[PDB]
Amino acid sequence: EGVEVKGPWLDDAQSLEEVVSYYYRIGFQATHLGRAIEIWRKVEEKRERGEEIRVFLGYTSNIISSGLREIIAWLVKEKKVDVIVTTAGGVEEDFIKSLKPFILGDWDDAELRKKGVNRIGNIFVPNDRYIEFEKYMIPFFERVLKIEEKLSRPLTASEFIYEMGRYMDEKLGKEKEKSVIYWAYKNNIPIFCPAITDGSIGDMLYFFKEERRDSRLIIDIANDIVKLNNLAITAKETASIILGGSLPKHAIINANLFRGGTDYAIYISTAVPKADYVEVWGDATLIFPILVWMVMKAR
Amino acid sequence: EGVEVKGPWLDDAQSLEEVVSYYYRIGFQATHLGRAIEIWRKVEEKRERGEEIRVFLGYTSNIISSGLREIIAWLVKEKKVDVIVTTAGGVEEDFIKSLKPFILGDKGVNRIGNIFVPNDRYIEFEKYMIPFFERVLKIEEKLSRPLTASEFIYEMGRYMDEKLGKEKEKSVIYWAYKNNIPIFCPAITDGSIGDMLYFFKEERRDSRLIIDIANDIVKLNNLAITAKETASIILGGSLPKHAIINANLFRGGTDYAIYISTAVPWDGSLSGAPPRADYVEVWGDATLIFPILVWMVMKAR
Amino acid sequence: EGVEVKGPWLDDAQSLEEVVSYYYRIGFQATHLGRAIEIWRKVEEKRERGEEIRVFLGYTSNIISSGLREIIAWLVKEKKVDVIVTTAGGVEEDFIKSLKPFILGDWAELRKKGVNRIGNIFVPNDRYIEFEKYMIPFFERVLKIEEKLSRPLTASEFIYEMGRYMDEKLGKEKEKSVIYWAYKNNIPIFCPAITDGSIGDMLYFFKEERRDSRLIIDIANDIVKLNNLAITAKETASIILGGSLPKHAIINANLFRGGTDYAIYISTAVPWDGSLSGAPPREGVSWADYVEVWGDATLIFPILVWMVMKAR
Amino acid sequence: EGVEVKGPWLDDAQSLEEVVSYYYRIGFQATHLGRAIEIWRKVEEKRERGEEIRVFLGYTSNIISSGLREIIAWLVKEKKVDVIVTTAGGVEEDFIKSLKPFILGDWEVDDAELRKKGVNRIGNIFVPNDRYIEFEKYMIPFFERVLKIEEKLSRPLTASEFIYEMGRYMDEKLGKEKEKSVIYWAYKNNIPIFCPAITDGSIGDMLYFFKEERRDSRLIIDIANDIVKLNNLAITAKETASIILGGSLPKHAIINANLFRGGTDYAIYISTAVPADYVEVWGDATLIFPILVWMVMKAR
Ligand SMILES: NC(=O)c1ccc[n+]([C@@H]2O[C@H](COP(=O)([O-])OP(=O)(O)OC[C@H]3O[C@@H](n4cnc5c(N)ncnc54)[C@H](O)[C@@H]3O)[C@@H](O)[C@H]2O)c1
Ligand SMILES: NC(=O)c1ccc[n+]([C@@H]2O[C@H](COP(=O)([O-])OP(=O)(O)OC[C@H]3O[C@@H](n4cnc5c(N)ncnc54)[C@H](O)[C@@H]3O)[C@@H](O)[C@H]2O)c1
């Protein structure tokens, strides 16, 4: 006799946490979210007992476009993860949100182009967000170039993003305290982004280089692979928490290839594709807040 | 809308419900679940002031295969919905679960995703269905007319009441019979009930046990027409989503709609058709979405 | 070793059929379509040599809404399938298309204009008004037949009589109709929820205006009918477009014989097991002629049918 | 009120091409594929009559894993596209396939047995381990050549120059099999291949061993100067067309490069991700793309 499939009886359940504790028994994806909760509960309890599991967190730009950005930022502030891989949008949107917020719209594209509003699903980014971002990135580019001139070597993408967090601390106010990039800098959590020029930052850098005839500002990706892979190899155990697919999933999986794979994995994805590995199929905005709370906060 | 996109800061949030209270301003599907909570809350307060809103609840068999069955039954027990349309699996698996439970999976075992239904579940179901068929035929001879599918399912709850003990009180069919909530299922013979009916008819050379579907369209369509307002809560696609939407065309459309499904429209399908500030679709597995939605509507404050 | 993954070289490929003959070694869903072509070619050749394989064809309403309607009708005309299971829309829209065509639109004020939208397909309201002029006399014939026999028709008998009605009342248009050719060629069409659509809508009006409770459509006796068709066959094959009731009914019927002997499933629904998984078309079977092709049938099915039936 | 929804009648239709010529009026995704055929025929016919339309081709690694690799290579050989954006897998699997083919993973093998045998599984496609050993045989000397070029120029190569040099290297060291390679024909036809995350894959894995064992930090792959090259190719064009298979970095990069000019002038997207010179065909590109290319480029 195996585990009985049963949902919560709502006359007896006393909290939403209690409802969610039944998810491992509900079946389908609820069962997967239930398994994810208690895979991460091990890793977190094991970490708090001084056991070394290096936690790799990967996400695509939609994660940062959404309100999950604040949950990611908290995870980094509280040192719940050790290594981040994301996309160009995952970096720049975290910075931009520290300047002006994104706005909830509705999933009239011709009107949006006329009004200069960038739409991400049902989330709107007005044009002045990118102008404000340029005001900060152009001086950041000059600083990166001077650092490279002083070092006589290019910065890697992760060093670039590390320097971004240092730059955020110097130039921004209280808004930086909900920033992933800021807390990664403060807690020395590297952020890898092998395609950091594929977005607004790259567009900024295009104008900087076109205006100033610069070819000396270099972003290297060859030396980050050593840094990322070594972080997986030198760990006694690794865990993978990957939201979405694309470059971050592939990079984290590929990095853990060398040590024979990650030792624990939680995948959350809408892309149709032991007890220590699970994928939850669904939108991370629905799933991730419940997962984090049940692992980090639930009593 | 125009609200700033923002997630909860977990240094401040006190409970999971407060976390979920941010969903409307999180973006993507979280925003859709946030709007679904607002919609059903609005309908549920209006019902509690005595405002007539006829709630049509539709779901496919996978909902009943999952632990959501207990949540559906509670919603039926507490009269949160007025009309049910489901599929054959949605009916017969609710009965079967009141005899033996489904087993969580990764020898004659029926697998539904990661859910196991061992063969003795259906063997036990037949021990109840064969006498029930005899009762249905005896009813139809007494009435000199066939039972419609909803009448057949109502009679199935009465039979559950007489023949079963405690475990019927987690059952959707039982509570629908107890509360006189009609369950429509115009393809009731599509699964296990059909299989044993097949055995029943071969065994007794019977062609007199008739299940009519022509008269339930009057019953279901009139339930949509006669109400002042209707609300449509639909899990999945297929026959139930189509029947509830089709029934509500006779009144010009439902007044509130919450659809939860994993299907998409680009195959052109009903299951993927969109819900048309009182209409919303949440894309995802209902076993993840529905318990959050019901709790925040029926028990959050 | 094994089959080398390889696409056609377009300096050498002479025809689209030659391009498609590479699909089995292209990988992903293209490999599955290649396997589906091989499976149905096998079934069709065995049938043409006199071996008995009862072919079950299932499809959802969308198949008939789309231009696949003409391809299904040709399959039924040529008796490439023996049994059909569909939904209410799959029946009624085939009849309607014999009266007035569906119109190509785009994927929302159509409601005041009285235009029903199915994806990027438009059905103007006069299609249903015209359909009603035919259904009301048909309902009256159905009632007379049921009074004559003192028994109700099943859905399959109802649909068979619909085809006889089309033969009597229509001209050349019926020659593109699934319902006409199924009646004409003695191919049963099962539809266990035939009231869930426009037929049921007009039956509601017919029942309301006449205060009728006597027009009965039975579903309990077709399951004997449908299940015996699967049991008595020496072999069966299941070609199923989409999900819902038709997929479940054909698989459920074939449970009684230990599962179908050949299966080709085409659906946009992502099975739990995987889009590339073996298991999806292997369900309900108890024993390598099983394949699922993931995608829109309007893309896949015309290629499959041509390569199986017409490519030389 | 418009076009009548109608499929082909198989008593009349004489060819598969004739069957596919009904796709525009079949509805759903068939209609989108018919529209994609019309759009690309328009682009191609304009190009054949001298009109400047810069064609950006984007695809993810699954495209090159599959048999579509031969079709992409033909498009590049015949100069049907002007700019390529792909991923690391899209680059390195094209090179590997010129060494040893990929194998159809037709049977059911559990991944534990696959890993014992050293077989990498990509969907239903198998890459046996000796493919990567043979790849390393060629990539280590290529790394050494790249470093010498960098020392010679006193500057790093960008990713697109790296891939261009990969094509030159293929032409020097490989035989007839290179004639079915995207990288080779892009080099011969001076078609740039952009890949802003070229180290996230097998090339990156071998560079790791190269750098780790040689304590090298001098071999650089720059991406800052490629965004200039790519964006200029879109801004300097009179008109642009985008043909994008799948999502990920290539789709984002091509859309981003066309942002400055108000977007591409024609777009054909083919993807499985759930979202009149612009169309998306929802489905597997291995099903759709061979039909689209034949009907655009060869159906007469
Ligand atoms: N036009 C209409 O959709 C229409 C009209 C009248 C009646 N109805 C009624 O709607 C009810 C429910 O719809 P249904 O059962 O016909 O199917 P459905 O619309 O519920 O679709 C079921 C599944 O079929 C698959 N599918 C749909 N289109 C596909 C395609 N082009 N290619 C591949 N797979 C595809 C998908 O997995 C989908 O989830 C039925 O009772 C039917 O009679 C529908
Ligand atoms: N569970 C079983 O194995 C079983 C048993 C007996 C009978 N049946 C019969 O199976 C037939 C066909 O199945 P059906 O009509 O119940 O549904 P279906 O298989 O037609 O599913 C239709 C749609 O439901 C949606 N869906 C499925 N699971 C979902 C989930 N967890 N959350 C959200 N959306 C979800 C999908 O988008 C899908 O396209 C019915 O006639 C039923 O009686 C099923």
Domain boundary assignment for chain D: 16-298
Question: How many degrees, rounded to 5, is the angle at CA A275 between CA A273 and CA A278?
Answer: 25
Residue of chain B whose Cα is closest to the Cα of A1:
B103
- Nearest Cα residue to atom 26 of ligand 2: B236
Residue B88 Cβ inside 6 Å of ligand 2? The answer reads: yes
Residue of chain D whose Cα is closest to the Cα of C34:
D287
Q: What is the least distance, in Å, from the CA of C266 to any CA of chain B?
A: 11
Q: Give the CATH H-level superfamily of domain D16-298.
A: Deoxyhypusine synthase (3.40.910.10)
Residue A61, CA atoms < 13 Å, CB-side half-sphere? 21
Q: What is the least distance, in Å, from the CA of B72 to any CA of chain C?
A: 21
Q: What is the H or E stretch that residue A28 is in? A: helix A28-48
Query: Do B285 and A279 form a contact (C-beta atoms < 8 A)?
Result: no
What kind of fold does domain B16-300 have according to CATH? Deoxyhypusine Synthase (3.40.910)
Angstrom distance (rounded) from CA C181 to CA C75: 9
Tokens of B203: 């065994």
Residue of chain B whose Cα is closest to the Cα of C108:
B276
Nearest to B289 by CA among A279, A285, A297: A285
Tokens of C266: 């085409």
Q: Mention every residue, 6+ apart, whose C-beta is less than 8 A from residue D144.
A: none
b/e map B112-123, b = 16+ CB within 10 Å: bbbbbbbeebbe
Q: What is the H or E stretch that residue D173 is in? A: helix D159-173
Angstrom distance (rounded) from CA B50 to CA D278: 51
Tell how far the Cα of B242 is from the centroid of ligand 2, in angstroms.
13
- Annotate A100-151 with DSSP letters as a single string: S--EE----HHHHHHTT-EEETTEEE-HHHHHHHHHHHHHHHHHHHHHHHHH
Alpha helices by DSSP H, chain C: 16-20, 28-48, 61-65, 68-77, 88-97, 126-149, 155-169, 178-184, 198-210, 222-232, 244-254, 279-282, 297-309
Nearest to B37 by CA among B298, B300, B296: B296
Block residue for tokens 């046996």: D128
- Calculate the CA C8 to chain-centre distance: 32
Angstrom distance (rounded) from CA C33 to CA C24: 7
Query: How many interchain CB pairs under 8 A, A with C?
Result: 4
The partner residues of B258 in beta bridges, in order of sequence, read: B233, B280
SS3 state at B232:
strand
Residue B266 Cβ inside 6 Å of ligand 1? The answer reads: no
Tokens of D200: 């996230």
The partner residues of B267 in beta bridges, in order of sequence, read: none
Resolution of the entry in angstroms: 2.2
Residue C196 Cβ inside 6 Å of ligand 1? The answer reads: yes
Contact D256 A199 (CB under 8 A): yes
SS3 state at A270:
coil
User: What letter represents residue C44's amino acid?
Assistant: E
Query: Do A100 and A132 form a contact (C-beta atoms < 8 A)?
Result: yes
Is B107 touching C (CB cutoff 8 A)? no
| Ligand number nearest to the C-alpha of B270 | 1
Question: How many degrees, rounded to 5, is the angle at CA B266 between CA B262 and CA B272?
Answer: 40
Provide CATH code, domain C16-310: 3.40.910.10
Block residue for tokens 């030792």: A263
The length of chain D in residues reads 300
Is C275 touching A (CB cutoff 8 A)? yes
Q: Give the CATH H-level superfamily of domain A16-297.
A: Deoxyhypusine synthase (3.40.910.10)
Block residue for tokens 């993807």: D271
The partner residues of B283 in beta bridges, in order of sequence, read: B261
Query: Do C215 and B214 form a contact (C-beta atoms < 8 A)?
Result: yes
Tell how far the Cα of C91 is from the centroid of ligand 1, in angstroms.
12
- Annotate A32-98 with DSSP letters as a single string: HHHHHHHHHHHHHHHHHTT--EEEEEEE-HHHHHSTHHHHHHHHHHTT--SEEE--HHHHHHHHHHT
Method: X-ray
- Nearest Cα residue to atom 4 of ligand 1: C89
Residue C13, CA atoms < 13 Å, CB-side half-sphere? 24
- Calculate the CA C272 to chain-centre distance: 24
Q: What is the least distance, in Å, from the CA of A27 to any CA of chain C?
A: 12
- Nearest Cα residue to atom 37 of ligand 1: C269
Residue B250 buriedness (CB in 10 A; 0-12 / 13-18 / 19+):
middle
Candidate of C61, C191, C219, C248 to mutate for ligand 2, largest count of ligand atoms within 8 Å of Cβ: C248
Contact C242 B210 (CB under 8 A): no
Query: Do A103 and B2 form a contact (C-beta atoms < 8 A)?
Result: yes
Angstrom distance (rounded) from CA C114 to CA C125: 5
β-pairing verdict for C262-267 and C236-241: parallel
